Design a protein around this ligand. Structure first.
Ligand SMILES: Nc1ncnc2c1ncn2[C@@H]1O[C@H](COP(=O)(O)OP(=O)(O)NP(=O)(O)O)[C@@H](O)[C@H]1O
Ligand SMILES: CC(=O)NCCCC[C@H](N)C(=O)O
Length: 267
């Protein structure tokens, strides 16, 4: 007989993009499941025997090497930041994004973005380092979400930032272009609106936003003690993984107990 929706959901959990198994077949659920379980077990065994690296960790290392080689300083700043920093990004209690914030005490929250820390490092380092100032951070960010198709509550952001000389739209696009061609991820850059900062570039993979990027200066800068030209962009690592490995849902690329490198751990 026909597969139930529940059964199809179960098989899809075990389906990988690589597979070429037709669900319109002359075989019962039990055999389709057993076959997929066997394949997925073999996938994990191959990883265990050979590379043993997590995709999210490996991607971070690859991105890190890319930016370190291009002259960007690697930053590791607090994940737990003051709620005040979020107000200073121009996000009042009444506004929309403030509901998305995971608060910890009355004082602190889980960073929804690394910008505050990047701006602070830029300002401080400008007193020590030659122009231009080039920095990047990769790490966890957190936002309460209703969507679970392209949106995680716990995700990993790459943010790079340059300040001083060379901070042009052209150079921003070149870094982005070299970065994504290096990772082997297809994209197009479009100039669209996003009132978290102002006018932006959007880096799209079809209908999926990989990044929102900014060419400063912007009026917010003075709140962070920045008074120089700057360029910057943020990318979600899980989105890059989702695109690179052709995962149907972003949860397959996330920190998870249910998936390892996009392979179900519920076998
Ligand atoms: N909840 C999330 N899960 C995974 N990645 C995210 C999430 N939020 C933001 N990102 C990534 O961070 C990049 C820049 O963030 P930002 O532009 O500040 O948020 P945003 O534009 O509100 N994201 P979106 O909801 O896709 O429009 C995005 O282009 C994504 O690659
Ligand atoms: C690099 C820069 O200018 N600002 C950083 C903004 C960080 C956004 C954060 N990483 C996020 O989208 O979650």
């Amino acid at each position: 007989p026909a597969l139930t929706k529940s059964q199809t959901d179960r098989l899809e959990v075990l389906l990988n993009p690589k597979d070429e198994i037709s669900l319109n077949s002359g075989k019962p659920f039990r055999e389709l499941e057993s076959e997929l379980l066997s394949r997925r077990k073999k996938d994990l065994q191959q990883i265990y025997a050979e590379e043993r690296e997590n995709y999210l960790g490996k991607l971070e290392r690859e991105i890190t090497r890319f930016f370190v080689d291009r002259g960007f300083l690697e930053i590791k700043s607090p994940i737990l930041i003051p709620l005040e920093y979020i107000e200073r990004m121009g996000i009042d209690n009444d506004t929309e994004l403030s509901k998305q914030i995971f608060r910890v005490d009355k004082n602190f929250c889980l960073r929804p973005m690394v910008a505050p820390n990047i701006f602070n490092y830029a300002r401080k380092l400008d007193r020590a380092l030659p122009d231009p100032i080039k920095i990047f951070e990769i790490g966890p960010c957190y936002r309460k979400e209703s969507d679970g198709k392209e949106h995680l509550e716990e995700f990993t952001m790459l943010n790079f930032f340059q300040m001083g000389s060379g901070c042009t739209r052209e150079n921003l696009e070149s870094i982005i272009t070299d970065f994504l061609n290096h990772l082997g991820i297809d994209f197009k850059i479009v100039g669209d609106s996003c009132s978290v900062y102002g006018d932006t570039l959007d880096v799209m993979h079809g209908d999926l936003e990989l990044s929102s990027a900014v060419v400063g200066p912007i009026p917010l800068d003075r709140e962070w003690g920045i008074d120089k030209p700057w360029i910057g962009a943020g990318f979600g690592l899980e989105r890059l993984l989702k695109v690179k490995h052709d995962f149907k849902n972003i949860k397959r690329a996330a920190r998870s107990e249910s998936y390892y490198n996009g392979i179900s751990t519920n076998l």
